[PDB]
Amino acid sequence: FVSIAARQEGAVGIIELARPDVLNALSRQMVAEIVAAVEAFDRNEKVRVIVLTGRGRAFAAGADIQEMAKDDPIRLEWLNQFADWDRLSIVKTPMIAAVNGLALGGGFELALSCDLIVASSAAEFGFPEVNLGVMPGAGGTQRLTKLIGPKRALEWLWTGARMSAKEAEQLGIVNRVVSPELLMEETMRLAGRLAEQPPLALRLIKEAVQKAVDYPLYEGMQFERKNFYLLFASEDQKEGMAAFLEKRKPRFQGK
Amino acid sequence: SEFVSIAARQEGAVGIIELARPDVLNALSRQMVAEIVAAVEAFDRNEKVRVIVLTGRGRAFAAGADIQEMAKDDPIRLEWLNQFADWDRLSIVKTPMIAAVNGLALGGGFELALSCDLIVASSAAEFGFPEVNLGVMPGAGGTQRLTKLIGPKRALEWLWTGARMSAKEAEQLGIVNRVVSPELLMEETMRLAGRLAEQPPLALRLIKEAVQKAVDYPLYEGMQFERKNFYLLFASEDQKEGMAAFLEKRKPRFQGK
């Protein structure tokens, strides 16, 4: 990798965007590396949680405009660059975005792709694409709208204005806001805690929530219960309930 | 001795179902769920019952489900059992349903409250899905109803941690309609229930269906369904009376037809 740095801490995989010189602008090259890194941690049974964060002042301020400026519809159609983003979407391992600073355009879309977001008090979110004559192309218009409704989404998408971490939290986009200096510490504590929950349960609960977003209630509940059944084939379910009935600490193993 | 885990009674045009197993904080067993379903469907069929209220006896609404009866289950037993079929039955009751949450509403308990149309909570009530900490997950619509109500980001946080949510926060999130003092719970609920019982029966019924469609259906198709119910309402005497009273600047007198 030449645009990111990855490391492991316990059962948590950490991915740091490493292009602070350009505020970690997400180039097609960088996105490719990020996906490769996420998929690698996902495949690794030892990594139960993945954390994304930015090196320097920003999380990710937009995408690389330079490599985009002269493109045309046909080149983009053949390129199919958002297929890399779709790969991120189907990763089943829990993912947390630790937004240390500016998260604009592609940067905001990268954060929205994660399951949880812990934001620095100094972080700001937004989609300035409209002011460049374009629009978000990596799910920004879709994920934002499902989270806050069309009335509010259009106001941010049509203006390209900057949203504060505090407002993102009130809107249900961000899970927690913490001081810049405590961001990583808080995020790692959360990740460590999640890595201690039954791995199968997190996995299947994540799938259910994803179906809940799209699926009609009845069919979503249909999918939900099938996952419920599957959990009773796991040792963690037997132990979790046995422990509950025996007033003792449960000992999970991810199987 | 109709039921063994619940107690049902009718007050005016309001049917009331009280979970009756406070010795176990009203833990929802598969048996209890079956009784709740029978009671609700009966109140639904009763032309005299226009609103159904669900509440818990004791200090808890329902604190989880009966773990002992499923602690040793396997996928096969559960597949043939199809226990959630009973929950789907509650889901399709057309009569308005209100949950008066008097305390702990966890796991299956939270799902029962979410199954209702409106939720009046005691400022002392707590909500949550502790299932993950038992090695499993909500299986009666919990992951679906909570996500639709508060979004995936917030939903996953609660579902993955199994942490308890306060009534106040539940209200801020649009999960709970109103929060009141513990001693005033059943009063606020029965008053709200009584007020709804005075609304045009057909209108409440059809508005409920439409809202349910609005959750699943794409806008255009949801609007196509909405208008069909709108047309149907003009075949009722209540529509004639309601609009007349409106034009005649007088209070309408509905009858339910």
Added chain:
Amino acid sequence: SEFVSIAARQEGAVGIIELARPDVLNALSRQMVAEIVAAVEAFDRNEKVRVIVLTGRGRAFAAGADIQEMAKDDPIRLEWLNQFADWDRLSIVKTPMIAAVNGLALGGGFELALSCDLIVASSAAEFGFPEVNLGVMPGAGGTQRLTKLIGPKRALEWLWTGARMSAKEAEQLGIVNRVVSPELLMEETMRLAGRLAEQPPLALRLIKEAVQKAVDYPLYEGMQFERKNFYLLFASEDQKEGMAAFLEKRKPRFQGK
């Protein structure tokens, strides 16, 4: 001059449609709705009009629908009338639309505002669906749009009670974009409209389409649609200009092509 219920005018790149029956609080009759749609579609097709503004003359935006004309109707008459097909036409207008709610916006009035992309409300504006109290229900998307915006628990309370919502509450719920003093409404709205009219026209257009799909489409398919619009924008002069004007650090000049 064949517009007896509304008045339309243009200022720069902004088209303004003013409901003109203050004598009856701009009650939405089938005739008035038909006129609104005709004017909006004309403004929509006119590429010189980049933003459309709807507002009411007098104290109200639109205080419900014409009930007298509706009072004696029956299901069959409503079926052949298919009056809501006109509302569907408003739903597909591609030009950005803003509702400047100067006052009461009840029933159809609330549905008219909800049909717009953004809502700027006077602090004196009140919203609501009193239809239930008339023995009916909203029939022009009210139950659908409200539910998608605030969830079923909260939507059902407003729909079942028919209570009035304040402009302040509507803003908190994410229904209204901003609240301003009565005497500043049109100034604020026209200001906003003017600004929007300066944004790259194709971007606003395709972004609006993408957002509409986001409400209905499952995430994966919505994203598939989104990127196709992303591709298309790179065939526009504004995209080349916008990005060039960004790398060169200068003011971009947009033309809508």
Added chain:
Amino acid sequence: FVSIAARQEGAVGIIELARPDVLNALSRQMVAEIVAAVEAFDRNEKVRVIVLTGRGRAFAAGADIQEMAKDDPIRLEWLNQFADWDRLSIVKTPMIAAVNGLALGGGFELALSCDLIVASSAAEFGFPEVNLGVMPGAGGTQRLTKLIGPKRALEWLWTGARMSAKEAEQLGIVNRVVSPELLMEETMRLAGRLAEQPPLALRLIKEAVQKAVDYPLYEGMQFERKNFYLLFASEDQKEGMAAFLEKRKPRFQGK
């Protein structure tokens, strides 16, 4: 029961409409009894397949017109009589319709509600509702359209014309057409064979097929594989694959 007669034979449950005096016209009470009978057989783990057929010359020719001739929309709305048909729709046990003669209106919808249809070469299908001033109300317009397309669906729904058993078979509505005196023989044979297949596999395949009708491919496949996973918790899967590998006849048990 007053309008139907139920009996068991091997692992097959038989429900015979018993009102030939009126060609088994489907009244609301009759549908209610059919549902009760089907759910009972469904619950009875001794019955692995359910067969529906009509006593006399007809399977079911329409519904009870006299019963609803004076109904209004409000009466029908509160009645919610099609909720009984919805109940038939969710029965998980395999169901087969043995159509002996006329299967019109509700009768045709009753056949379409089943999973497979075997019909006498003398049987006829159709929706004459249009000629009574109404339309099919128990899934007829929906199930027919999904099987043969809107162009052909409208042709039959708008005219109310009668379709020959042979035409239905060619359209993919009817699975098999046999001579009148062999209808029950062929149907019971088929029922027996299916009763010998692994019950869980039939059950889960039936759910998947139902989802294939209503789900976009990607999501349908998501549901499909979850059912696939579930079957590996069964003894029938182990035995089924073992027998295949051991080139011997399998002995399934429904678990």
Added chain:
Amino acid sequence: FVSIAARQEGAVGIIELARPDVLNALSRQMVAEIVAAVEAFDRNEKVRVIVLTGRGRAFAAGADIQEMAKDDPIRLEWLNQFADWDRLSIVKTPMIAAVNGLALGGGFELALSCDLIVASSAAEFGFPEVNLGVMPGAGGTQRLTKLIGPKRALEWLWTGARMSAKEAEQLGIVNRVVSPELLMEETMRLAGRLAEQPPLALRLIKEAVQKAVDYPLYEGMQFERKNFYLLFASEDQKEGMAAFLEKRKPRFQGK
């Protein structure tokens, strides 16, 4: 109207494409006229059926080639010409296409937009656009696929080959095939019979069938039954069922 000719006859509205010199090539202007005419007939409760046909030897040999030569992406986006095609899609009055000859590209799409298709023996269908490096843009890919499946649809759409009236009938696309000189007479006869069917029944059955094409079964049945209820508010339902019981010929009034 300089591209089409509209006229009534009985309770049947007739629309004739009138640019035989150019084989009725569908131009934006012509489509605009077709929409105006159809919507006028739709709103008129005196016209119970609408028939579309072409003058000369063809139904419609495609779209206006001049448009295809002048159009560009942005221009097309602003024109939103296919919105007019969407209007045809929601016409509630029964519509019949009498294909008198070539129905290629937009021509095929126009025919597919009708509820039923009566074709001449010499009529041929197809989407040759691919050969010009273009694709159907008026529902062709959508409607063809829903009628014959993706495997078969892709062959026709990818090759651009012509389909015979006979094969179309076999595929359930065309409802009936007749000789060239009996086309109109046979179509007007069918239109006449349909015009005698209960108007409300036809209207609501059409709505239901349209939902069946898209809706999941359960939701479709939900819509279907609401329309069922509504029909019991009409005099035609009471007259139809009463007449059926009284053994008399019903007199429907469309109310």
Added chain:
Amino acid sequence: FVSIAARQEGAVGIIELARPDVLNALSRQMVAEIVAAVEAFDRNEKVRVIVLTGRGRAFAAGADIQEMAKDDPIRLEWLNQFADWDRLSIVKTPMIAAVNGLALGGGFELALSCDLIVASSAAEFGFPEVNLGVMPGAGGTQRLTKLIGPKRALEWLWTGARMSAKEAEQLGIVNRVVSPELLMEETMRLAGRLAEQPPLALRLIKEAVQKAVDYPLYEGMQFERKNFYLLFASEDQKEGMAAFLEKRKPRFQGK
């Protein structure tokens, strides 16, 4: 590769399943190779068509049963083997399956994953999974049901019986049936023809057909017209028009 052989002839990529010793039984490793080969051909803008066929007497006769005979649900859940099949599903390059022999289970599902199927008159299709105590887990229940309807799909899925090439073609599953010895000749001729068509048009048409299968009509058409617009940004669209007005053969370059 150890289970397949990839070859490039002109603008056509050919993948030969090469484990005739086991009738090309599809193991998880083999599927992985197929995906790798297919995606490689897909990315190569010099390969316009991909053909899949089986070495030996069978195309692929089921999956590797030994490999999964003792698997449990948890093992399968973590494995997520069908994610490889989802990758096949999203390949945008045209794909044709040349079915030489038996195409059972995963084999049938592999053929179904292709856009077009040319089969030997001696080939047979089927889903024997049910007879092993399981069910198809790679889209079989989904794709088959969408192609032939729930009545006919269940018949085959519940019985596991083998379907002839002839019937498959009558059902709309198979595009063409030819003499065993002419299988590749025909397939390569079809492949050669498609290779001559406009690459972008085939690509965007394929996407539209895929939407048509799932999407409701109105939304499918909104997607369709967007692709329609994009094609007018291609040089091939101009070349297509030019070649026509000049009455000559067009030379498309995929731009």
